[PDB]
Symmetry: C3
Amino acid sequence: TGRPEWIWLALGTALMGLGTLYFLVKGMGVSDPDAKKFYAIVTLVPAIAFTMYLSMLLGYGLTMVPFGGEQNPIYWARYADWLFTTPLLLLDLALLVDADQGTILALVGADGIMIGTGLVGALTKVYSYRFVWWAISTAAMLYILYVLFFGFSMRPEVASTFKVLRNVTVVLWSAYPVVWLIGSEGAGIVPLNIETLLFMVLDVSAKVGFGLILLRSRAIFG
Amino acid sequence: TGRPEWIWLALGTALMGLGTLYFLVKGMGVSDPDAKKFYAIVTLVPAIAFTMYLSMLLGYGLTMVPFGGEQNPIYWARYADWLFTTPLLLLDLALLVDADQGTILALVGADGIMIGTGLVGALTKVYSYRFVWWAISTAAMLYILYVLFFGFSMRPEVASTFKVLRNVTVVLWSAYPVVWLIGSEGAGIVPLNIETLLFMVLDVSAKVGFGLILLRSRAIFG
Amino acid sequence: TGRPEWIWLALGTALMGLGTLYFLVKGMGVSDPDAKKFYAIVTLVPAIAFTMYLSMLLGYGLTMVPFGGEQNPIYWARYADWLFTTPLLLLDLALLVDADQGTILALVGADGIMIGTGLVGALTKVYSYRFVWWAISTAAMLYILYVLFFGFSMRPEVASTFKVLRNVTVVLWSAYPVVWLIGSEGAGIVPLNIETLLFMVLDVSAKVGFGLILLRSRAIFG
Ligand SMILES: CC(C)CCCCCCCCCCCC[C@H](C)CCCCCCCC(C)C
Ligand SMILES: CC(C)CCCCCCCCCCCC[C@H](C)CCCCCCCC(C)C
Ligand SMILES: CC(C)CCCCCCCCCCCC[C@H](C)CCCCCCCC(C)C
Ligand SMILES: *C/C=C(C)/C=C/C=C(C)/C=C/C1=C(C)CCCC1(C)C
Ligand SMILES: *C/C=C(C)/C=C/C=C(C)/C=C/C1=C(C)CCCC1(C)C
Ligand SMILES: *C/C=C(C)/C=C/C=C(C)/C=C/C1=C(C)CCCC1(C)C
C-alpha cells in the first residue's frame, strides 16, 4: 500500500505468524500440566499479535484522530493486542515464581489500566490531555515493574530464568512509553514508519524472543 | 418490522428466554459444588444469547457494512454473544473431563481468536479480505475441534456424556463457518432471512439442546 | 467546562484518586495471601473508577444519543467502569464467605448482563425500548441481590462483616436503577447535574466507603 510503514507491518505479521507455528509445533506432545500452561501462553501471545498485525497491515486496525488541527493516523489495533497479550506475558512470570493470587490480580488489573488509558490517550482529540493519559498509563507501568522487582526458596532454575525474563521485560516494556511519546501518538518527533518499525522490533522481541527464552528453560516443567 | 428475518429473531429471542427460565428453575436447590458449576454455565449461556437476540430483534445489534459497492446489513451482536458463550460452552466440556488448566487456556484463547477474527471479517470493507479473516477464524475452529478430539480413567459416566456432547459440538459448530461463507457476510448466495433462520436453529441447538443433554446426565454431580 | 455537572465529576475524580492512594499505601507490607487478595481488589476498584471519572471530566467518556427528538448527553464511561468494578466488588463478597466457584460464575455472569444491558439501554435510540433494557438489567440485579441474600460454620468474623457489607450493597446498588430511571438516561425528571451528583455519592460510597469497611475487619486475614 501507499503507507510507508506497510513493510514493517508485513514483516511483523510474518514474524508473529512464523513464531506462532514454531511454538505450536514445539509444544506438540507436551504432557506435564505445568509445561502445558507455559506452552499455551507463549503460543497464544504471538497468535494474537499475528491477527492484530494483519489487521494493521490490511488497514482495518487504523483510524484517523484529529488533534493539533491535523488528521493523525492512529493504529488502535495495538491496544486490542496488548490488552490481552501483556497480562498473558505477566501471567508467564507469575506462574514461574508461583505468585499469590492477590498479586496476580494486582498485576493484571494495573496492566488493564495501563493499556486502557494508553488507548484513551491514543484516541483523545485534545492534544494536552493525551499526555495526561500517557502519564497515568506510565504510572501503572511503573507499578507493574515495581512489583515484578520488589514483590518476588524456589528452585534455582526458577530464580535464574525469572531474573533473565524479568530484566528482558523491564528493558523492553520501558521503551514503549518512550516510543509512544516521541511518535505519532505523542509529540510526533519521529515519523510513523520509524515508529512502526520500533514497535515491531519491540513486539517480536517481547513475544517471540521472550517465549524462546522461556521455553528453553527447565523451570517450566514440574 | 420490515426485516423479513424478524420472525426468526423473535423466535430465537423467545426460545433463548424460555430456555433460560427453564434452566433457572431446574437448578433451584442444587447444592453439589460441581453440579452448581454446570447449572451456572448452562443457564448463563442462553441468558446471554437471549439479550443478544433481543438486541438484534430491536435493531440495536445491526449495522450496515459497505462492500461490493452495496450496503450490507451485518448483525454484529452475534459476535458479542459468541465471544462469551462459546468459551463458556468449551468450559462445560473441559470441566467434564477435568481438563488441565493449560489446555483450557489454549481453548479459550483459540476461541477468542475465532470470534474476534470472525467479527473483523464481518466488518471488513474490502470484499476479498473478508475471506482471509474467515480462513484464519476457521483455522482457529479446527484447532479447537482437534483438541476436543485428540487431547482428551474417568468414570464411564463422564466419558459417555463427553462423547455425545463432543459429537454435538463438532457437527453444530462446523456449520457456522459454512453459513457465514454462503450468507450475507460472505458470498451472499443465501439471503439474510434464511441465514438468520439457520443461525437460530444452530444457536438454540448449541445452547439449549446442548444444555438439556448436559443437565440430564449424572456426570455433572460429584 | 460549561457542563454544570463538571464539579461532581471533578470531585468524583479526586475522591477516587485519593482513595486509591490511601488503599495503595495501606496495603504496603501485607503478606498474608488472603488479605493480599482483598487489598488488591479494594485498591483496584477505585483506581478504575478514577480513570473513568477522569475521562468523563475531560469529556472523553461522553456521547450524544438521539431520542425523544433530542440530543441526550450520555456518559458511557460509567458502564466501562462498572463492567469491571461491580464484578470485583462481588468477588470481595464471595471470597469472604468462600463462595463455591459455580456461584461466583453465576454472579459475575448476571453482573455482566446487568451492566451490558444497561449500556445497551443507555445507547438505544428508540425511547420505549430503553426501558425494556432497564427492566432486563434490573432483573439481573435482583438475581444478584437474591443470591447475596439467600445463597450464603464460617468464623463469626466473616459472618459479621459479610452481613454489614451485604446490607451496604443492597441499599447502594438498588439506588442505581432508580437514578438511571429518573435521570437523563431514562425519564429525564432529574437534570444531569443532579444525576451526576447522585452517582458520585453512590460510587464513592460503594467503592471507597465499602473498601474502608472491608479493610477495617479481621475477616480478611487467614
Ligand atoms: C528456532 C528459533 C530460535 C526461533 C524460530 C521462530 C521464528 C520467528 C522469529 C525469530 C526472531 C526473533 C528473535 C528475537 C530477537 C530479536 C530482537 C528480533 C528482532 C526482529 C527483527 C528482524 C530479525 C530477523 C528475523 C527474521 C529473525
Ligand atoms: C423440557 C425441556 C426438554 C426443555 C424446555 C426448554 C424450552 C426451550 C426450547 C426447547 C427446544 C430445544 C430443543 C433442541 C433441539 C432443536 C434442534 C431445536 C431447534 C429449534 C427450532 C424450533 C422447534 C420448536 C420449539 C419451540 C421447541
Ligand atoms: C482515612 C479513611 C477513613 C479514608 C480516606 C480515603 C479518602 C477518600 C474519600 C473518603 C470518603 C468516603 C467515605 C464514605 C461515605 C460517604 C457516603 C462518601 C460520600 C461523598 C461525598 C463527599 C464527602 C467528603 C469527603 C471529601 C470525604
Ligand atoms: C506484546 C507487547 C508488549 C509487551 C507491549 C507493551 C506495552 C507497554 C508497556 C505500553 C505502555 C504504554 C505506556 C506506559 C504509556 C502510554 C502508552 C503505552 C500504552 C504505549
Ligand atoms: C452459541 C453459539 C455457538 C456455539 C456459535 C459458534 C460459532 C462458531 C463456531 C463460529 C465460527 C466462525 C468461523 C469458524 C469462520 C468465520 C465466521 C464464524 C465466526 C461464523
Ligand atoms: C462502583 C459502582 C457500582 C457498585 C455500580 C452499581 C451499578 C448498578 C447496580 C447498576 C444497575 C442498573 C440497573 C439495575 C438498571 C439499568 C441501569 C443500571 C446499569 C444503572
